From a paper:
Cytochrome P450 3A7 ([name]) is a fetal/neonatal liver enzyme that participates in estriol synthesis, clearance of all-trans retinoic acid, and xenobiotic metabolism. Compared to the closely related major drug-metabolizing enzyme in adult liver, CYP3A4, the ligand binding and catalytic capacity of [name] are substantially reduced. Despite high sequence similarity (~93%) and overlapping substrate specificity with CYP3A4, fetal-specific [name] has a significantly lower catalytic ability and generates an altered regioselectivity profile. Comparative analysis of CYP3A enzymes shows that decreased structural plasticity rather than the active site microenvironment defines the ligand binding ability of [name].
Since the wild type (WT) [name] resists crystallization, site-directed mutagenesis of surface residues was conducted to find a variant that promotes crystal growth. One such variant, R69G/C77G/K244E/K421A/K422A/K424A (CYP3A7mut), was produced, and its 2.15 Å dithiothreitol-bound structure was solved, providing the first insights into the molecular architecture and enabling comparative analysis of CYP3A enzymes. CYP3A7mut crystallized in space group C222, with two well-defined molecules per asymmetric unit. A bulk of positive electron density above the heme was seen in both molecules of [name], indicating association of a small polar ligand. Among components of purification and crystallization solutions, only dithiothreitol (DTT) could fit well into the density. The DTT ligand is held in place via water-mediated H-bonds that, on one side, link the hydroxyl group to the main chain atoms of R372 and D374 and the heme propionate and, on the opposite side, connect the thiolate sulfur to the iron and the A305 carbonyl. In DTT-bound [name], F304 adopts the upward conformation, and its phenyl ring is stacked in a hydrophobic cavity formed by L210, L211, F213, and F241. Thus, the conformational switch in F304 is likely triggered by the distinct fold/composition of the F-G fragment rather than association of DTT. In [name], D174 is replaced with histidine and H-bonds with E163, which immobilizes the helical core relative to CYP3A4. In other words, based on spectral, functional, and structural data, we suggest that the lower flexibility and inability of [name] to change the shape of the active site to optimize substrate binding and allow spin transitions is the primary reason for the diminished catalytic activity and distinct stereo/regioselectivity profiles.
Residue numbers in the entry:
A (entry chain A): 25 to 262, 269 to 280, 286 to 497
B (entry chain B): 25 to 262, 268 to 280, 284 to 497
Write the structure that this text describes.
C-alpha cells in the first residue's frame, strides 16, 4: 500500500527525491524544512515534487505561478490548507475551515481586523509592554544573560490570550492564574506530536477517529476555556477581539457562540509562537548590529522622547523600525512555507497539476535566493527602504503569505511587535554576551526554531 | 506511532540494526533473509534484535537457549507462530492454530503421520515416480538442458495434491485437469504478496478485516476445492491417502473429532506446507549430484545394490539407502529452505540467563547455524559424510534444524524424506545428471519466502544405457 502515489511525479516528469515506502521523503525533513527545501531547489531547479507519507507535494518557485495559485485561482482550485486530521468543533476555526465555510468565516471576521479597529485596540495592549519592561528589567539587572524567549514569549502569550479571551493576564508575575496555566497547556499542542506524524502515514484513520469524537486538540483544556469564557460573555452584558466578535453577532449568518470560541482559540495558536519567535529574531539582529540598533533608538527617541508611551499613530511613524522588522522576516520567515491543496486538475503558467496534490510555496527558499536578493544572507534593512519598493515582488517575499488566504492577523502582529520593541528599546540596549550562539543555528520544528535559546545581555539606558 | 517498540532492544542491552519508523528494518530483508541473518550474526554476535514493522524479533544462536525455546518452554511460553494476518476458517489449519486449539489438532493429526501409515502410503505414491520419469525422459531426450523445477515441481504438486485431496492428478500430462489449474491457482498465494506485507506495518487492521470476513487466502479457489472434496468423500462411502486417514479419524478420546471444515483446512495447509519445499530441495539435491559426480555414482551404486535392474522402490527398500540419506541431509544443511524458525513469546520469561519480554518473536537462524564454522568443518563444502553413523554425535539437533524441532516441528518431515527418496531413486535409476553451459556455478540465491535460486537450475540429463 505504502507506494500507490509514489509514481506520480515521475510519471509527470517533475524531478524530485526518491520516496521510501510509507514514509515518502519525511525522514529527509528532520534536518529542517528550510534546509531541505533549499537543497531541493539547488539540485532540481524551479519545480520539484516530494512525498510526506502518501501525500505528494509540488514545490513551485515561479512568481507568476505563485500569484496564480495564491490569488487568481484561490477560491476555485487552491482554496484549502492540508488537514492534519481529526478535529471536532475546531472545524470552524478560520484556518481549518474549507471552501464556502471558510469564506463565510473570513468574511465575518474581516470587520474585526480592520486598521481602524486595530487603532482602537492599541491603548489596551500598550499596557502589556509595561509588564515586558518589568519582566526584562528583573532578568537583566542581576547582570545575567537574558533568555529572550522567557520575556518575549510571555509578552506574546499575554497580549494574544488577553485580547482573544477578553481577560487581562500576566503569565510571569501571576503564573497561578488558571488562564495562564490552561492557555500554557493549550499551547503544548504542536503539529509535530506523534499523533499528527502518524496520521500523515495513514490518513485513512481520520474518518474513524471522527466517528468516535476524537480530536487532535486538547479536549479538556478547551472544555475549561470555553466554560470560562461563557461566564465572561454573560457578565460583560451588565475593544478586544472577543468584544468585536460579540458585536458582529447582530449576507452571511452571524457567528455562532461555538464558532466564536473556535476563532479565539485559533488566534492564540496563530499568534503566540510566531510573534514570540519573530521578536527574538529581531532583537538578535539588533544586538549583532549595533549601529542598526542605535539608529532604531534614535528614531524612537525622535517620535517618543523621554520614554513617552507608544501609540498607534506614533508607532505608525517608525519607518526605519518597519524596515528592520521587514528585513528580519525576510531572513526568518517563521512559517517556512505556504501550502494549498489542489481541488481539481488544472494547467497554469505552463504546468499541469493533478487533483489532490498539495502546492507548496517555499517562502524561505525564495527569501534566501540569490536570484532575487544581493548577498541574501546579509542583514541589510535598506532592502526595504521606500525607494527599493519596486524591486520587491510580493510573491517572492511572503512572510505573511498572500492573497485571500493570507495572514489575517498580519497588521495586528506588526503593530504589536512594534509596541513591544519600542518599550524595550526605550529602556534597554542589547549586546552579545558569552553564551550567544553566533552565528545562530536553526533547528527542526513546525516553525523556524533556534538550536540553542537566544541569550543576550540587556543594559539599561540611563 | 511508528517507533512505539523501537527502543525495546536498546532498553534490554540487545544489539542490532537501527530501525526506521513504521518499517523497522524491513527494507534490509529484500536482499534475502539468509544473507541478512548472516550479516547480523557476523557484526552483532550471539544474539541480536530486529524489527519487522512494529514487531520485534530476537535472534538466538545458543543451542541450549534454542532447546529451551523449541522444547522445554513450548506449550507454556513459545507455542505459536507469528500471524500474517486475517484468515477465515483456515484458523483451524494446524500451522496457524494456537494454544489449546493447536495442541488439539496436532494430536488429531498424529495418527495420520505415523511411520506405519507412511509405509502403507508408499504403494500409492510410487506411481507418481513413474510419471516423473516419463516427464524427465521427454525433456532430456533432445539433448537440451533440463529446467529441474519443471519436472520436480510437477512431481511435488502431483504427490501432495493427490494424497491431500484424494484424487490422482498428473499436472504435466493432463494439465487441463480442473484440480490442477485450481491447485496451481491456490499455490499462487505466497507469504510475500503485498497484502500480508502491509498488514505487518499496521497489524491492528486484522480484527477489522476479519469482522468483514476478509481473508488473505484465495477464497475463490478454496470454495471450489471444498465442493470438489465433498463429492469425493461420498463416492468413497460406497483409500489410504491423507484424506482417508483424516476421514477415518473422524470416528471419543482426549479430543473431539475433526470437523469436516477442520479436515479441509488441513488438506489445504498440507499442500502449502509440502509443495514448494519438496520441489526446491529435490532440485538442490540434483544440483549437488550433478556438480559432485562421484557422489552421484556412489548413490547410483547403492541404488543398484538395493534395487537392481530398475526394481521399483518400496518403503522397506528406500529405508535401506543409508548413503542417499546422507546426501539429502547434507543438501538440506546447505539449503534449509525455511531459513529460520520463529516462536511468539507468550509471556515474560528468562531462559538460560536471558530475559525475553512478552510479545517478542524469538527467531532461530537455521541457515546461519547451518553455515556457521563454529559447528561445522568447511561449512561451504558439500560433504555428505558428516551424516555417517560414525559422525552421529557431531550433529547438534538445535544447530541443524531444516525441519524445525520439538512439538511444533514439521509434522510432514518423514513423508517428505520418503517422498523425495522415492523420486530420486526412479530418476537416478534412469538418468545421470551433468552441468551444462547454463548451470549457474556456484549457485546464486534470491530473496523470497523460501530459499530460492537467482536463475532456475538447468542441467543436462543423460539416460543410463
Ligand atoms: C509575526 C507574527 C505572524 C506571522 C509571521 C504569521 C504568519 C502567517 C502565515 C505565513 C500564514 C499563512 C498564510 C497563507 O497560507 O497564505 C498565516 C495565517 C494565519 N494567521 Fe498569521 N502570522 C502571525 C501572527 C498572527 C496573529 C497575531 C494572528 C491573529 C491575531 C494570526 C492569525 C492567522 C490566521 C487566522 C491565519 C489563517 C488565515 C486563513 O486561513 O484565512 N497570525 N500567518
Ligand atoms: C522438504 C520438505 C519440507 C521441509 C524442508 C519442511 C520444513 C518445515 C519447517 C522448517 C517447519 C517449521 C517447524 C518449526 O517451526 O519448528 C515446517 C512445519 C510444518 N510442515 Fe513441513 N517441511 C517440508 C515438507 C512438508 C510436508 C510434505 C508436509 C505435509 C505432508 C509438511 C507439513 C508441515 C506442517 C503442517 C507444519 C506446521 C506444523 C506445526 O506447526 O505443528 N511439511 N516444515
Amino acid at each position: 500500500y505504502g507506494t500507490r502515489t509514489h509514481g506520480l511525479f515521475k510519471k509527470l516528469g517533475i524531478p524530485g527525491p526518491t520516496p521510501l515506502p510509507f514514509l515518502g521523503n519525511a525522514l529527509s525533513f528532520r534536518k529542517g524544512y528550510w534546509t531541505f527545501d533549499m537543497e531541493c531547489y539547488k539540485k532540481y531547479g524551479k519545480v520539484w515534487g516530494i512525498y510526506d507519507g502518501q501525500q505528494p507535494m509540488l514545490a513551485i518557485t515561479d512568481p507568476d505561478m505563485i500569484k496564480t495559485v495564491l490569488v487568481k485561482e484561490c477560491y476555485s482550485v487552491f482554496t484549502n490548507r492540508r488537514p492534519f486530521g481529526p478535529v471536532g468543533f475546531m472545524k470552524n476555526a478560520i484556518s481549518i475551515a474549507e471552501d464556502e465555510e471558510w469564506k463565510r468565516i473570513r468574511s465575518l471576521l474581516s470587520p474585526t481586523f480592520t486598521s481602524g479597529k486595530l487603532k482602537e485596540m492599541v491603548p489596551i495592549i500598550a499596557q502589556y509592554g509595561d509588564v515586558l519592561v518589568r519582566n526584562l528589567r528583573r532578568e537583566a539587572e542581576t547582570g545575567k544573560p537574558v533568555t529572550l524567549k522567557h520575556v518575549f514569549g510571555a509578552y506574546s502569550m499575554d497580549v494574544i490570550t488577553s485580547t482573544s479571551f477578553g481577560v487581562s493576564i500576566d503569565s510571569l508575575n501571576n503564573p497561578q492564574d488558571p488562564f495562564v496555566e490552561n492557555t500554557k497547556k493549550l499551547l503544548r499542542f504542536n503539529p509535530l506530536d506523534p499523533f499528527v506524524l502518524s496520521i500523515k502515514v495513514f490518513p485513512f484513520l481520520t474518518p474513524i477517529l471522527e466517528a468516535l469524537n476524537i480530536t487532535v486538540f486538547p479536549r479538556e483544556v478547551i472544555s475549561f476555556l470555553t466554560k470560562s469564557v461563557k461566564q465572561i460573555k454573560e457578565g460583560r452584558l451588565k475593544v478586544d477581539f472577543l468584544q468585536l466578535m460579540i458585536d458582529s453577532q447582530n449576507t452571511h449568518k452571524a457567528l455562532s457562540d461555538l464558532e466564536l470560541m473556535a476563532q479565539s482559540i485559533i488566534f492564540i495558536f496563530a499568534g503566540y509562537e510566531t510573534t514570540s519567535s519573530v521578536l527574538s529574531f529581531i532583537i538578535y539582529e539588533l544586538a549583532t548590529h549595533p549601529d542598526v540598533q542605535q539608529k532604531v533608538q534614535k528614531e524612537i527617541d525622535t517620535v517618543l522622547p523621554n520614554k513617552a508611551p507608544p501609540t498607534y499613530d506614533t508607532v505608525l511613524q517608525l519607518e526605519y523600525l518597519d524596515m528592520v522588522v521587514n528585513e528580519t522576516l525576510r531572513l526568518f520567515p517563521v512559517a517556512m512555507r505556504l501550502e494549498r491543496v489542489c481541488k481539481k486538475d488544472v494547467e497554469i503558467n505552463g504546468m499541469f497539476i493533478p487533483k489532490g496534490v498539495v502546492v507548496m510555496i517555499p517562502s524561505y527558499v525564495l527569501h534566501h535566493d540569490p536570484k532575487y536578493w544581493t548577498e541574501p544572507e546579509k542583514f541589510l534593512p535598506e532592502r526595504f527602504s521606500a525607494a527599493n519598493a519596486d524591486n520587491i515582488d510580493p510573491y517572492i517575499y511572503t512572510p505573511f503569505g498572500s492573497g485571500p488566504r493570507n495572514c489575517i492577523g498580519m497588521r495586528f502582529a506588526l503593530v504589536n511587535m512594534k509596541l513591544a520593541l519600542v518599550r524595550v528599546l526605550q529602556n534597554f540596549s542589547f549586546k552579545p554576551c558569552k553564551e550567544t550562539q553566533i552565528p545562530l543555528k536553526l533547528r527542526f520544528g513546525g516553525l523556524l526554531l533556534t538550536e540553542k535559546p537566544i541569550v543576550l545581555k540587556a543594559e539599561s539606558r540611563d
